């Protein structure tokens, strides 16, 4: 399996209510492992998974120190940007940063990414080159010359090919119990009369990690069912994920359609068809 | 591990 470490950062200005709300979260794959919240009484970076709790004081001190310096950058930028866009001091705006590193089955570096957003739109994105910047509008171009001048891309590259993939691997080891598990879908199926002419079959996949998965139907033909009601995969909130796909079928051909679940946790792709 | 690099004003 490919793996990924991702840091997500959210700063919301709220003038007259004091300093901007700042929420940092760390993920490895689909497992959140740290968080910061400027509004919690801690003012520390804090664990959100068992395997990171085993790191010592210098790690928490450091992640706390770094995370606060990210939140301070964002404080300045809510100001600078409000300026660049000629917006008033009243009214609340959002800055979002995301960055991390992919690795493949070899745990070797694969890609790196670092993007910024103002008010839910792309502001500045590092390209896959880990060197070139894409800039949305005349304003992002100003940030672009600033960052090119100071070789921000070089610095991030260092982190992104260096520290990022190293500590990703260090987490994948320490947390082998959590992170390199593969919980297979527990799967049932449901029936529902819609008409005298039409039924509904639902393919349930519940209690699977990681969250990547494929639910697809067919019958009498390898070519799937073109059109299918499938829901966005959703966190069960215990650590696993859930998802169904469902299709509408003739009263006649109930037990003729079949559902095809694919998942790293499945030695071979599962296959199911209706039975009372 | 958070970056200690390349985190820069806009």
């Amino acid at each position, epitope marked *: 399996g490919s793996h990924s470490m991702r840091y997500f950062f959210t700063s919301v200005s709220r003038p007259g209510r004091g300093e901007p709300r700042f929420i940092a979260v760390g993920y490895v794959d689909d497992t959140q492992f740290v968080r910061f919240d400027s509004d919690a009484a801690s003012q520390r970076m804090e664990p959100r998974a068992p395997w990171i709790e085993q790191e010592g004081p210098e790690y928490w001190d*450091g992640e706390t120190r770094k995370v606060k310096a990210h939140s301070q950058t964002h404080r300045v930028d809510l100001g600078t940007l409000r300026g660049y866009y000629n917006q008033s001091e009243a009214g609340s705006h959002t800055v979002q940063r995301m960055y991390g590193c992919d690795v493949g089955s070899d745990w070797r570096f694969l890609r790196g990414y670092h993007q910024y957003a103002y008010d839910g739109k792309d502001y500045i994105a590092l390209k896959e080159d880990l060197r070139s910047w894409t800039a949305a509008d005349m304003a992002a171009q100003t940030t672009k010359h600033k960052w090119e001048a100071a070789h921000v891309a070089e610095q991030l590259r260092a982190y992104l090919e260096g520290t990022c993939v190293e500590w990703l691997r260090r987490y994948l080891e320490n947390g082998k119990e959590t992170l390199q598990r593969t919980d297979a879908p527990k799967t049932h199926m449901t029936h529902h009369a819609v008409s005298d002419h039409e039924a509904t079959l639902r393919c349930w996949a519940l209690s699977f990690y990681p969250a990547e998965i494929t639910l697809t139907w067919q019958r009498d033909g390898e070519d799937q069912t073109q059109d299918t009601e499938l829901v966005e995969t959703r966190p069960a909130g215990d650590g696993t994920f859930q998802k169904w796909a469902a299709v509408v079928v003739p009263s006649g051909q109930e037990q003729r359609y079949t559902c095809h679940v694919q998942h790293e946790g499945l030695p071979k792709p599962l296959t199911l068809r209706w039975e009372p | 591990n958070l970056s200690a690099l390349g985190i*820069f004003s806009t």
Partner: T-cell receptor
Amino acid sequence: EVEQNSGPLSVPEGAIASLNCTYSDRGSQSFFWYRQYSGKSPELIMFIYSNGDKEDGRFTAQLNKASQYVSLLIRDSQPSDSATYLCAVNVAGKSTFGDGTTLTVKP
Amino acid sequence: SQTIHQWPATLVQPVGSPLSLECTVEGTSNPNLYWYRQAAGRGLQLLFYSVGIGQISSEVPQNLSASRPQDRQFILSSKKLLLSDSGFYLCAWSETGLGTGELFFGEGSRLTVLE
């Protein structure tokens, strides 16, 4: 922790001075040589963050993150290069300094 | 330098005197700011780290205090100096954020405390 040898490290005028600095923290992410003439405040001479060599005039740094050291070589040493040379490592937004390496360039 | 001034430059003061050292900085906005001390050797010990105005962090517990009234004004103080507080007190600033980590230093304040 960051370790560099106290001098006095004595080197003849014109030779290469080789200064070294080890560090233990796998959290480290950038690396610095400062120069401090006595009575005075440190001034940066080198920053490096990618494994390799970086050369500015008569100064060359070598960072190795695997072997966990950063070197400074001063080729063609002047007696005016005589100074205390401070190594510094960014662990987690905190620059930690070694106790410095004193260098006399004998004229 | 010209981006960062610091005073007073040299101080002889008896055990139990109060201490005020001032650091101005000009030509940057929203710097990180640092109080370093050099004593009993070369090599800098970090005393105070400041990510922004009014925000100070004490990195070791101590009979010294610091405050950042303005973006570009940093103060280190004591109510009662101990012998141990002898040292070369250095103010430094760093670009907003975690950039490269370059520290620009003031010309330092040399404090000798006598019994």
